[PDB]
Amino acid sequence: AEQFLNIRSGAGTSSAKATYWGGEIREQNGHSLVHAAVVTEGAAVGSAEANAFSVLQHVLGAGPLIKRGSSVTSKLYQGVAKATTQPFDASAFNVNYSDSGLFGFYTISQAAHAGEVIRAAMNQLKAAAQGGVTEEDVTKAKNQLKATYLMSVETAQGLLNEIGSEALLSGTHTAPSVVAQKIDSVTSADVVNAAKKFVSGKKSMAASGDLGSTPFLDEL
Amino acid sequence: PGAEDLEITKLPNGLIIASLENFSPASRIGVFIKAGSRYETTANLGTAHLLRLASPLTTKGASSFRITRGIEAVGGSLSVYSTREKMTYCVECLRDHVDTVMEYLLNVTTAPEFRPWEVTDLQPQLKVDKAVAFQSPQVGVLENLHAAAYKTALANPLYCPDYRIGKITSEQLHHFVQNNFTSARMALVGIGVKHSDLKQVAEQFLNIRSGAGTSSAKATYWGGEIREQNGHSLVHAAVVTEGAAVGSAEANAFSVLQHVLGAGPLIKRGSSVTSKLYQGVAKATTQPFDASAFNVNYSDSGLFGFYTISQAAHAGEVIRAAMNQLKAAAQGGVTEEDVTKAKNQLKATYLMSVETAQGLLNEIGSEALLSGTHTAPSVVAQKIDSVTSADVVNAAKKFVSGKKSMAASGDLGSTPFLDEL
Amino acid sequence: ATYAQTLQNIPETNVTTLDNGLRVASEESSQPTCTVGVWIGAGSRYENEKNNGAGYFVEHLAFKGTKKRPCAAFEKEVESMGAHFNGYTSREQTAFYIKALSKDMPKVVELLADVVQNCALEESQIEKERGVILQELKEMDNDMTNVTFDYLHATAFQGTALARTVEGTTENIKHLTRADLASYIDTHFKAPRMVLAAAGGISHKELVDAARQHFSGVSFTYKEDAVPILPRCRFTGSEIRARDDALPVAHVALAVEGPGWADPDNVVLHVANAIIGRYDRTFGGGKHLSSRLAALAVEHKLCHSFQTFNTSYSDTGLFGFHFVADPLSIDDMMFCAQGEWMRLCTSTTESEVKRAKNHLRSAMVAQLDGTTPVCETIGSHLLNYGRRISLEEWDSRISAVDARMVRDVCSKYIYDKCPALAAVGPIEQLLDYNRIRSGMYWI
Amino acid sequence: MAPNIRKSHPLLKMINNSLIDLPAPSNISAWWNFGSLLAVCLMTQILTGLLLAMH
Amino acid sequence: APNIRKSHPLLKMINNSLIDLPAPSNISAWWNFGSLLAVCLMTQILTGLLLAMH
Amino acid sequence: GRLMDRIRKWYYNAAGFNKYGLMRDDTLYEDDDVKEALKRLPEDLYNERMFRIKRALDLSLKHRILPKEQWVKYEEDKPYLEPYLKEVIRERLEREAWNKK
Amino acid sequence: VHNDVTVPDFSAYRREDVMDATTSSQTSSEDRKGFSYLVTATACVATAY
C-alpha cells in the first residue's frame, strides 16, 4: 500500500448530494410478466434508522428461505398470495446509500394480476404501519437478519467485502458482536415507525412489461 | 361559372357526404374516419400506424400492383394522414380522372385484404417510417408528452412502439377496420366535384356497417414528467396542462391566448414583438432559442402550454422565463389591444390555412365528420371576437393552477423538473 | 364540368406597366385572404466576385426595418395585422412577399415599396446579421443536398458567375460594407427589373393605383429604363468529388446544360423527367412504382432516394438527377440511372409519355395551390417568360409532346454529352469520369 | 438480384472482375506493360505454333 | 485462418468443389459418370501423350 | 365425366410419389411461380412440406419407400399449394398484360 | 464551408475553343467530339486493315 501505491490524495471531486425526486417511469414492452417496484426515501448507510428498515425488511419478508417454499414468516408474500390466484413474487426492497436511501417493495406477477399484486402489497405495508407488527415478528426478523449477515461472510468475497466496506467508510471494524446489538436494539415501535415513514413519504415507482393492468403511483 | 354552394347530404346509416365544386382543374376526394391510435390497447399497440402504411396493399377489388399502377397512370396520388384520433385517406387528381382514382380510394378504405405475406413483408417499413419521422426532436418529445399528459387512449404513441414492430397480425388489422371504419364514423368529403356525383358513389359503393363499433376509453389525465437525456446540444421542452375539447367555446379562449403569447414568427427571421412569450424569453437569455404557445384540442380533452428549444445551458432560464411569462398573463398581463391583435392573427391564420386544396378539404371534412355540419367562415369569425379580455386571462390562470405534464430531451443538464416551475 | 373547361375559366392574369418600368400583375380570386409581393430580377449571378453574398446579406435586412419605420415599428405594424412577410434570394431571382387579408391589399403594397426602396440598413444591425449569416452557413453546410447542388453549379459553370453560391463566401460575409449592401440595392432593385404581383381577392385596378402611389420611381436617362443582359455562363463537362468516408450516405448529382426559360423544349424535358420521376424510401408504391429507376431502386436497394430535375435559367440551365445512396450501391445506382437516361433518348414509349404528361399536368396544377404559389408563378413568369403562361396554354403545349419528340429532344440534350458531376461523402465505389462519360451513349 | 449482366453472369463476372472493373494503382508505369505483352506473346506463340505444327 | 483449407487461394478451390461441396443426399449411380467422364478425359490425355511420343 | 376421374386415381397410384409420403404439390418443380407460392405458405404447412420432402430424400438415399400403410391415399392428398400458385400466376399475368399495354 | 470551395482554373489544359468562360462551349462541342472520334475511327480502320 505504502512503498507501492501512489495517485492523488484528498476527496478529489465530491458528489453533488442526492436530491430526491419521487418520479414514475413506466416501460411498456409486451413481456407477459410485469415487474414493479415502489419505494420512498429510506435510511442512509450508518444511520440507526436503517437497522429499523433492515428489520422491517425481514419482517415483511425478503425472499423465500425454503426451496420452492411458501414464506409464511413473510408478511408481504403471504399478504399478496391471499390476494391473487396466479404465480408471483413480491419482496421487501431496501438500499442504504451514503447520503440517502430507498425502501419499498418489488413485485413480479402476471400482467393481468399486476393491479391486485401491487395494491395488495401496499395495504400489506400500511397494515404494518398501523401496529400490524408483533413483538414476536420483530424477534424472528432479528434472527433472520443475524443469520443472513452471519452467513453472507462465509465466502471469501463476502468476508472481504464486509471488512473493506467498513474499513473504507470509517476505517474501523465493528465486531460481529456489536453489529448483533445494533440489531436487537430495534424496538417494535421503530419498525412500525419506518412502516409509517413509508406510507407518508413521497414515493417513486418503476415498472416494465405489458403494463395494461398496472396502476400509477397516484392510485396506491 | 362563379361560386356555387357547399352541399352535405347525410345518408341513413350515418355516412356523411360533403362536396364543393370550385371548378378547380383538379379534384381531391377523401374518406375522413374517426379512427386512430387512441382506440388501441396494450394488446394491439401500433396497429393503427401499420394500417396507415397498408394503404397500398391488395384489396378485394384492386391488387397492390393495380392500385399503384392505376393511380400513377393518370397522374393521381394517394395519401393517408392521421392524428391520435383521426384518419384521413384521400386521393387527388385532374378532374377528368376522379372515377378512376375513386375505385382505389374506395377499395382501400373498405375492401382491404391484409394478406399475411403482404403484411409481414410490410412491417419492416414501420422500422424505417419511424426512423425518418423521429429525425425531428419536435416529434420525439410530443410522443412522450402525450405519454405523460395522459393515462390512456391519447397516451398511446402515434408511431408503433418498437417492441411491436413485426408483431401486428392481419387479424388485428381487420378487427381494427371492422370496429372503427364504420359508416357512422366515416365522412366522404370532396372538392372540385358535384354533390350529386360524390353522393352517388357513397351509396352505390359503400357497404360497411355503422355505429362506433368499439368506442374509446375516455382519456384520463395523468400529469406525467418524461425526461430523455441524450446529449444532443439543443434542449427541446414542452410544458402543458389539460386544455379544451373540440367544439368547446372555452377552446376559443386558448386559441386567442395562444396568439397572444405568440405562436411562431410571422416575419422571416423576425423578432416577434407581438409575441408576449417570445419577447419575454429573449429578455431572459443571451443565446439563440425558440419558444411558442402549444395548443391541441382533442375530442374528450386537450393540452395547452409552451414548447421551447434552446441551448442546453440556457435551458433553465428559457423554460422558467416562459413560466413567469405565462403567469404575468394570468395576472392581468393582457391588454384589450393584445386581445384584438390576436383575434386578427387568428382570423388571418385560419383564413389562409384554407387556400391550399388540402387545407380547405381538411377544414370541410373535419367538421363534416365531427358534426355533419358546416360553419361559414362568417360564424367562425364571430366565435373568435366573442372572446373577452377576461376569458383569456382565465385560460391563463387555468394553466398556472391545473396539474401540468412535461416532456424534454437533450443534454438535460440544466433543465428543471416539473416541480421547480 | 370537364377539366378542359375549368382551365379556360380561370380568370386571366392582368398586367399593367408604369412609366418607371415597374410591371404590376395579378390574378383575381374571391379569396378573402391574399398574397402580394415584388419579384426582382436579381440574384447571386448579378453579384461579382467582390460582393458575392450581397443579395443574401440584403435579404437579411429587408425585414429589420426601413428609414420611415424602424425595427419594432415595422414588425409591430406587420405582426399586428396578422400578416406574414417573408422572401428569398436565388442565383438570378430575388423575391419579397406578404400574406395578408385582401382588405389590407393597399397598405401592404406601401409596406413592400418601403422595403425595396428605403431599407434602413442600420449599420448596427448589419454587424449582427453578419454573425447570423455566418451561422446559417455552418448549418447549411450540413445539408448534403445543398452542398451537392452548389458544387454541381461550382463545376458545371466553373469560371462563371453561375458557379457561385447564393449565400456567398465566408470572407465576403465577414467584410461586406454597409456601402456594398447599399449600392447592391441601388444597382439592382430597379423598377424595370421588379414585378409587383398579387393573387386573391384583389382588384387589379386597386392594386395598380397603390403601385402608382408608393412605387413612384423616376426615370430620366435611357440607361435607367434598360435591363442589362448578363454575360453568358460556360458549361463544362467536368466533375468535383468532395470525399468524406465519414458521412453515412453519399450524394451524387449529374447533369447536362439545359436550354433556358424561353426554349419550348423545356416542356418536353419536363415530360421526360416525368417518366423517370423521383423516389424515396417512404413511397408506399414500392416494387410496383411506374418509374423503372424507382422500381429498380426498390428491387435492388439502390438508394435512399433519387430525383430528376430541370433547373432553368435565362440563357442556360441544368438538366440532371440527384441520388443519395449507401457507399456500396452508388455504382449500381449510377449505372441504372444513366441506363434510363439512355433509354429516354432511344426507346421512350407512347405509354410512358402518356403517364408522364398526366403526372406533369398534375404537378403543374399544384404549382398554383394558393395565393402565394400562384403569385410566385406570376412574378416569375413575367420575370422569366416575359408574360404569363396559363395552364390552358401549358396543357396545350404538353399535349403536343409524344414519344418521338421526347426521344429527339432528350437525345439532343443528353446523348453523347459531357456531363457535370458532383459527388459527396463515401464516394469511393462510384468512379472514373470516363466510365461515367461512356454511360452517355448507346442504350 | 444483380442489375447489370456484367457483374452477375458466371463468366462475364470474370472478364469484368479482372479486365474491366479491376482496381489498379493510378500510377503504374510502362514497366507494368510487360505482364500483358508476356500474355500476348504466349498467345501469339501458341497460335503461330499450332499453324507450324500443322506442317 | 482459421483453417488453411477455406482461406488459401488454391485449396479454397479444391475444398470448394471436392470436399465441402454440398451434394444431395440421394443422388444415385447415374451420377457417377460425371467423374468417370472426367477420369476418361484424364486417362485419354495421359495415354495419348505417351503414344504421341512414338 | 367420371372417366378421367378414375383415370386420375389410376395415374396417382401409377406415379407413386405417395409411396414416399409426398403430396402431389410436394413433387412440383420449383420454378419462379412455385417458389413465390411456397413463400406465402403459412408456417405449419411450410414446415410440414419440408419434413415430408426431407423424409423422402432420406428414403431415396436409402432405396426404400414407406410401408404401404403410410402411403398417401388419392383422396387424402392435400393440394396445399395449388391455390396459392393459382393466385401467383394470376397476379403475374395481370402485370404482364398491363406492361404490354 | 462548402461556399469557400472553387473549382480551380483549367486554362493550361482547356481546348482553345472552350477557353473563354463567356462563350457557350456547346457550339464547339461537335468539333471537339468530332475530332477525337475521328482519330478513333481511323485507328479502327487501320486495325481493321
Ligand code: HEM
Ligand atoms: C511457350 C511458347 C512457345 C515458345 C517459347 C516457342 C519457341 C520455339 C522455338 C524457339 C522454336 C525454334 C524456332 C526456330 O526454328 O528457330 C520453335 C519451333 C517450333 N515450335 Fe514453338 N514455341 C512456342 C509454342 C509452340 C506451340 C504451342 C506449338 C504448337 C503446338 C509450337 C510449335 C513449334 C514447331 C512446329 C516448331 C518447329 C519448326 C520451326 O522451327 O518453325 N511452338 N518454337
Ligand code: HEM
Ligand atoms: C478426348 C480424348 C481422346 C480421345 C477421345 C482419343 C481418341 C483416340 C482414337 C479413337 C484414336 C485411334 C485409336 C486406334 O488406334 O484405334 C486415337 C489415336 C491416337 N491418339 Fe488419341 N484420344 C484422346 C486424346 C489424345 C491426346 C491428348 C493425345 C496426345 C497429345 C492423343 C494421341 C493419340 C495418338 C498418338 C494416336 C494415334 C496412334 C494410335 O492409334 O494409337 N490422343 N486417339
